[PDB]
Each structure stands twice: as C-alpha cells, then as structure tokens.
Amino acid sequence: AAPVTHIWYFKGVPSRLGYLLDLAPKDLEKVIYFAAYMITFVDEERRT
Amino acid sequence: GALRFGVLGPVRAWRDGETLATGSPQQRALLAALLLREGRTATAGELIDALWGEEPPSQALAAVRTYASRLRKVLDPGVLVSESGGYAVRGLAEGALDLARAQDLASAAEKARSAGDLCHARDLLRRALDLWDGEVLAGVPGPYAQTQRVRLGEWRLQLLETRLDMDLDQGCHAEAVSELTALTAAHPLRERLRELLMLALYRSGRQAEALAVYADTRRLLADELGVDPRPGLQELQQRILQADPALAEL
Amino acid sequence: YTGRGMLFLDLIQEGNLGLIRAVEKFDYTKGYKFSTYATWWIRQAITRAMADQARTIRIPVHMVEVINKLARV
DNA sequence: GAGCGTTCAGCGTTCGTTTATCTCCCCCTGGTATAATGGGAGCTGTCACGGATGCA
C-alpha cells in the first residue's frame, strides 16, 4: 500500500548509498523512519 | 438378528436365516469392497476406484453416497459407520464372514497337520471347501472385484491341492482319481493337479493311464506355451519308470 | 498479552483498531465514562487478532477459545 | 406333418445406471457499558584492520 526503501541501497557503506541525494545517513534515518520532515518541493517562482 | 455375510459366492447377507436384499450389482461391489477390509475404513477415493477404476463418471461420488444410504436401509443401524468421509462395516461378531470362517478353519488345519491329526485336518478342509457357493464375487462388476476373484480363486485351489495330498497320504487313492478328472478338465494348465493325479493313478495301479496323462500334457504345454513340464513332474514320471517301491508306502 | 507469538508493537496497532470502533458506538446518553466502554472493545480486538494471527498454521477462532479454556482448567 | 430344434425379434418389465433434488455443523463475524490512560529487560567483556564520520 505504501512504498518502502531497500535496506541494501541505503543503510550501508557510502560507496553503495553514494550520497546520490546530498543527505547524511543520520538525515536519512530521520526522514524514512518518520521522525523528521523533508521539503520534497518548493514553488520558488510563486514565492517571488 | 445376527448378520452373516457371504462373499465366497454371490454377495449375500442373511438376518436370522432370512435373506436380505443386497440390491444392485454396484451395491454388491460396494459391500464387497467394504467387507474385505475387515473393519478398516475405506476412504471415498478408494471406493470410487474400487467400483470404476480409471474411468469414473463425473458425479460418481454422489452415486457412491446413494449406494451407501441404501445399504443402511437393509443392514442394521450402526453396522455401516460413516468415518473420515468414507465408510466402514463394524460390529460384526467373529466368524460372521464366511471368508473369515474359511480362513479360521484353514489356520486350524495347519495346526492339526503339525499335531499329526490328519483325519480332523481333512474334515476341517472338507468343511472349509463347502463354503464355496460357486464363483467368488459372481456377477459383481468393477476392477477391484476382479483382483479378488483371481486371488481368492487361486487360494481355493491351493487349499484344494493340500487336501488331496492328505487324502492320498492316508491311502484314499481310488476316491481321489474321480474328483481330479473334473478338476483337470477345468484347470488344464495346472501341472500340480496332474502330478497328484499321476501319483494317485500309480497307487491305483493305472500306470499305463498315468503315463497317458503325461503324453497329452507334454503335448498340450508344447502346443500352447512351448515349454516342458517342471522337473518335479519329470522326476515323478521317472520314478514310475524306475518302478520305485517308496512311492507306494504311505 | 505480550510474549505470545505476537510482537508487542503489533498488539498496540491491532488494539488501536478496537479504539476507533468504540468511539463510533459511544454516547453521553449512558451515564458512564468512556474508559469503561472502551476497554471491552480494546480487549476484543486484541484477543481476536491474537487468535487470527499468532500461529503459523491458522486455527479458527472457535477452536482457539476451546484450547485456551481447556488449558486453564 | 409330428414333435421338437436353433435362433433371431422386438417387446416388455421392471431393475439397471448416473443424474437430479433436498436437510445440516464448522467457520466467520459482532458485541459486551463502574473505572481502568506511556513496556519491561537484557545486556557487558575476541582481535585486528580500515574507512567512514564526527568534532575540537
């Protein structure tokens, strides 16, 4: 019903997770396990 | 009210001497298939396979249920139990089945032989053979009944061969030749019956007729199978040819 | 009801379903607190789920109530 | 022809069949009305090596 994330590709050595999104592993632990929010998108043009 | 069952001829049942209407051929097939397990439950799969084999009708299971219900109307309540989705016959007294009655007499006869009571052993075998009211499972359709006809028909012949040996051992040669001529006509390929006949003929002094028995048999087995008689028949032939006195002493 | 083949956090979530049931069937016309009404529904949801989800080979709910009854006696 | 001799015949005559009806327990679901309102709990000590990851 709700998507999940592969344990292999994140939560491992940084040659495989890779920082493909510029986020620390502590940052990732907070967002995907429902402890902190992320701003997935901003209407930066609207705001101006 | 004592139920008795007959399977050594047409499938029959009696209650207090009155003959019960065992029904259609398929019901006799079902009853025989249930009687021969001696109280062990037969699953619905085994009963379908017993009646029709590899080609059952698409609604065969409902037919089996119909036959089972009708047996409950003629048999006493509680003998035909419904268990594990199948049926079993329970609560019969010991020896209520003639097959069991025939089997019990045969086991006692072996003990009587081991105890040396050949006269009682002959009588026990005589009482046993009288239970055959013709062809076992006569007129009963289905593949399962077919296997029992051959298996139990052979067993009758095996008991028959043993009785003649005991009769011949007591010197009753002259009576045995008459019955054996009918038996060899019905069972021409059974070499053991011809072995007993030739020995009986010699002890009845009919050596020339005994040798005549060898000549047709040797030709007949050559004609149908191309085979010589077994060594046991050959040695017995030779002992007549050697005029061995040790065959005539009981 | 922890330590019976169901994880402790899993028990909370199933009981949580019982709570949302209870509020739809509760009203002020009865002169009683919500706490007394709720606990019946919480216990119902937890014990039914325990019957329906603990064992690898599923056992029907009425067989389950039979075996724990005979076990206690 | 006498008297009975074999063998189709189609016809009944219900018994043969499989196929159609119809009555019953496991199994699943819903519901209890005093008040009850944030876990137990099991750990711990090998050893070296390296590279990520934190922080003075």
Swiss-Prot record, chain A:
<comment type="function">
    <text>DNA-dependent RNA polymerase catalyzes the transcription of DNA into RNA using the four ribonucleoside triphosphates as substrates.</text>
</comment>
<comment type="similarity">
    <text>Belongs to the RNA polymerase beta' chain family.</text>
</comment>
<protein>
    <recommendedName>
        <fullName>DNA-directed RNA polymerase subunit beta'</fullName>
    </recommendedName>
</protein>
<comment type="subunit">
    <text>The RNAP catalytic core consists of 2 alpha, 1 beta, 1 beta' and 1 omega subunit. When a sigma factor is associated with the core the holoenzyme is formed, which can initiate transcription.</text>
</comment>
Curated annotation (Swiss-Prot), chain B:
<comment type="function">
    <text>Global regulatory protein for secondary metabolite formation.</text>
</comment>
<protein>
    <recommendedName>
        <fullName>Regulatory protein AfsR</fullName>
    </recommendedName>
</protein>
<comment type="similarity">
    <text>Belongs to the AfsR/DnrI/RedD regulatory family.</text>
</comment>
<feature type="DNA-binding region" description="OmpR/PhoB-type">
    <location>
        <begin position="1"/>
        <end position="91"/>
    </location>
</feature>
Swiss-Prot record, chain C:
<feature type="region of interest" description="Sigma-70 factor domain-2">
    <location>
        <begin position="1"/>
        <end position="56"/>
    </location>
</feature>
<feature type="short sequence motif" description="Interaction with polymerase core subunit RpoC">
    <location>
        <begin position="10"/>
        <end position="13"/>
    </location>
</feature>
<comment type="function">
    <text>Sigma factors are initiation factors that promote the attachment of RNA polymerase to specific initiation sites and are then released. This sigma factor is the primary sigma factor during exponential growth. Its activity is stimulated by RbpA.</text>
</comment>
<comment type="similarity">
    <text>Belongs to the sigma-70 factor family.</text>
</comment>
<comment type="subunit">
    <text>Homotrimer (Potential). interacts transiently with the RNA polymerase core complex. Interacts with RNA polymerase-binding protein RbpA via its sigma-2 region (residues 211-347) in a free form.</text>
</comment>
<protein>
    <recommendedName>
        <fullName>RNA polymerase principal sigma factor HrdB</fullName>
    </recommendedName>
</protein>
